[PDB]
Amino acid sequence: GAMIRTVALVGHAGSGKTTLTEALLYKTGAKERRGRVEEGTTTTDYTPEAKLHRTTVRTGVAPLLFRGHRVFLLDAPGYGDFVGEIRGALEAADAALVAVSAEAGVQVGTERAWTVAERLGLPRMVVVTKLDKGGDYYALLEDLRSTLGPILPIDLPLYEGGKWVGLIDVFHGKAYRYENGEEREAEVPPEERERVQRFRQEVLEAIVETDEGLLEKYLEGEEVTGEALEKAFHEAVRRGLLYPVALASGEREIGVLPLLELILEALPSPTERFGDGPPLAKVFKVQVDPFMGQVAYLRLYRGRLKPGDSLQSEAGQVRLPHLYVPMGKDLLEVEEAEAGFVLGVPKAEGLHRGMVLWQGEKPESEEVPFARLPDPNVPVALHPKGRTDEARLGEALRKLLEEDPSLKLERQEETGELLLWGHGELHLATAKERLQDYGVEVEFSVPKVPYRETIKKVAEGQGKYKKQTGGHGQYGDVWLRLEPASEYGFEWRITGGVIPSKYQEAIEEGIKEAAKKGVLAGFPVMGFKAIVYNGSYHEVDSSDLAFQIAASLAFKKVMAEAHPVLLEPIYRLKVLAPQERVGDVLSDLQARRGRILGMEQEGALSVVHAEVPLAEVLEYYKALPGLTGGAGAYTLEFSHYAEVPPHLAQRIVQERAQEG
């Protein structure tokens, strides 16, 4: 009684998560009718991006109430594009419910969520959906055992003439059939009894083996009570030693409430994870929905709260005059919150994702769940469409990054572009759409390549600056030798004190400044050693400015005599692709001026290692799917700069010259 559970519902895209969530909200009476993803009427999927793309872009909270018990279910995204929200939902929960389609089995997205849950130390339960589409549940159980390990079948499917109509609860040897979401007990079919019995024996044995007390009794032949077995089961799941497998479909309305009862029976309470104590909470996500302002979503891990209470935070006291539990986009006021609750805090402009809140002694890192977000690796250059957009862009981006810290916004020092980094093509599309929701039209372009320049031969010469302005003049005289080198180097080789040492810093500054814009095509210059070997000064007119200029003039003159050449960045490209698709991958890489370094095999898959010019793969992320039938994956990492083939170089050099 009064039990509470916090659970993240994760799984590969399209595994039936939101549909199950809708069914749970409907069956518990939280809403009048079960909405549908295909009609845009679900509680979770309410933002324009979620509905347009028919996928959960943003985690939705479903605060389920059932017979006085509460399950705060976090309906999370399926696509890796939304890793931010997925990891945030897992961070916020005490267990993971992993949806697996009976048609597809464990998919890449299933494994990703499973792994994150494992690293967080979270118990896991599997719910098998879509069996109505025709799959083999028994083969799926074997596959789950092979891939995930200690699974524990709770349910087996009840069929009538080949049609899936219900559940056989292995433990109790009872069956239930459904007609229009309504359940009635049925008999376990005669032809199924022996198999059902086998599974029951297997389940009993798996549970007994996890408890020293029960294990002792079984070896001796003593009786094991149902109560003892229930407690052992709960304890084993709590420790991640058994993974219950349930069967339910929100589309066919089969096994929905039984799944909720199993969540309560099998998954841990907040007290079982954190113990009792002072309030401990964390902002696991943030929404800045148009016309709503910033709302911070808080998981209360421990403690209890009443309206008017306050929590400490790195930004000072956070008062909560009103407590609200979120249901999708709605905030429902409550009069108390206990550990396990997820709260929605409105007017939360000062509360950011990842912020820890507490009472008493501040927590250290080991006390707060944390799932690191991998850096976004897909860049696009951002451009406001017009005047109105440029004026509104800064604030819209501020809102976008508050809501989604998995994006990275950076001013590319070298090329001058404003870059937005995301986790995939879909991720970036949803960001563009979100900026549009905020009233700003932006366009994405392929980022400019940071070309550079260097020299091929030694050269030397003079840089001199002498002028008089008013009653004070200027004088700088520098002799500079430039030599090709693997890395930058500055050498002071002044002799006889012809230039005082106090001007060394200014001279190096001037060389570095001129090196920012090479003589070949105006790109930063690298790969040279600069030697200052002679020069002169005048006590009166000499200064740092005169020497910075003289040094810059010397650099420009000398680099031009040093046979300058264009360089481009080269990246290491790893591509994982089906064996039958390898030919297209290589064929295409060859057209991208790629250099195959070698290949490895991972099943019918093969890993292709190559080096390719960054300029040939800035949109590789868009082409990979078509080249690998959607099964491919890739990683790009900077390797080194290399001279641009004479043909390309000329055209690039010409382009830069022609305009600018």
Does the footprint of Mg ion cover residue 56 (CB under 5 A)? yes
Q: Which stretch binds Mg ion (CB under 5 A): 48-56, 114-122, 260-268, 440-448?
A: 48-56
Question: Per CB under 5 A, does 129 bind Mg ion?
Answer: no
Determine how many CB atoms are found less than 10 A away from the CB of residue 645.
12
Check whether 495 is labelled as a binding-site residue.
no
294 interacts with Mg ion by CB under 5 A: no
Smallest distance, Å, CB 456 to ligand GTP? 54
| Phi, psi of 519, rounded to the nearest 5 degrees | -75, -20
Is 388 known to sit in a ligand binding site?
no
Q: CB-based burial of residue 533 (10 Å sphere; 0-12 exposed, 13-18 middle, 19+ buried)?
A: middle
* Smaller CB separation from Mg ion, 63 or 109: 109
Name which of 127 and 644 has its Cβ closer to Mg ion: 127
Beta-sheet pairing, 4-10 with 96-101: parallel
Q: Which amino acid is at 595?
A: R
CA dihedral 498, 501, 507, 509 (to 10 degrees): 180
39 is in an annotated binding site: no
CB of 86 to ligand GTP, least distance (A): 9
Of 351, 344, 347, 310, nearest to 327 (Cα)?
344
CB of 258 to ligand GTP, least distance (A): 15
**Binding of Mg ion at residue 59 (CB under 5 A)?**
no
**Per the annotation, does 310 bind a ligand?**
no
Find which of Mg ion, ligand GTP, none residue 38 binds, CB within 5 to 8 Å per kind: ligand GTP
Size of the site for Mg ion (CB under 5 A): 3
Looking at residue 371, the DSSP 8-state letter turns out to be -
Residue 55 marked ligand-binding: yes
Binding site for ligand GTP (CB under 6 A): 11, 13-19, 37-38, 55-56, 77-78, 99, 129-130, 132-133, 249-252
How does DSSP classify residue 644? P
Instruction: Tell me the backbone φ, ψ of residue 480, rounded to 5 degrees.
Output: -120, 135
112 is a contact residue toward Mg ion (CB under 5 A): no
| Residues 641, 624 contacting (CB under 8 angstroms) | no
> Residue 656 region, left (φ>0) first, then alpha (ψ -120 to 50), else beta?
alpha
Q: What is the pairing mode between strands 595-602 and 528-536?
A: unpaired
Q: Is 422 annotated as a binding residue?
A: no
Cα dihedral 181, 154, 192, 197 sign: negative
**Closer residue to ligand GTP in complex, CB, 433/561:** 433
Closest distance of CB 369 from ligand GTP, Å: 22
Q: How far is the CB of 109 from ligand GTP (least distance, A)?
A: 8
Task: Say which residues have a Cβ less than 8 Å from residue 358's Cβ, sequence separation at least 6.
Answer: 278, 279, 280, 281, 311, 312, 313
635 is an annotated ligand-binding site residue: no
In the complex with Mg ion, which residue's Cβ is closer, 17 or 282?
17
Nearer to ligand GTP, 86 or 188 (CB): 86
Between CA 338 and CA 4 the distance in angstroms is: 8
Q: Which is nearer to Mg ion, 89 or 507 (CB)?
A: 89
Q: Are 376 and 421 in contact (CB under 8 A)?
A: yes
Q: How many CA atoms lie within 13 A of 253 on its CB side?
A: 16
Residue 58 contacts Mg ion per CB under 5 A = no
- Determine whether the annotation assigns residue 110 to a binding site: no
Binds Mg ion (CB under 5 A): choice among 17, 27, 423, 481: 17
Q: Smaller CB distance to Mg ion: residue 18 or 101?
A: 18
- Binding site residues, as ranges? 14-19, 55-56, 130, 132, 249, 251
| Sites of contact with Mg ion (CB under 5 A) | 17-18, 56
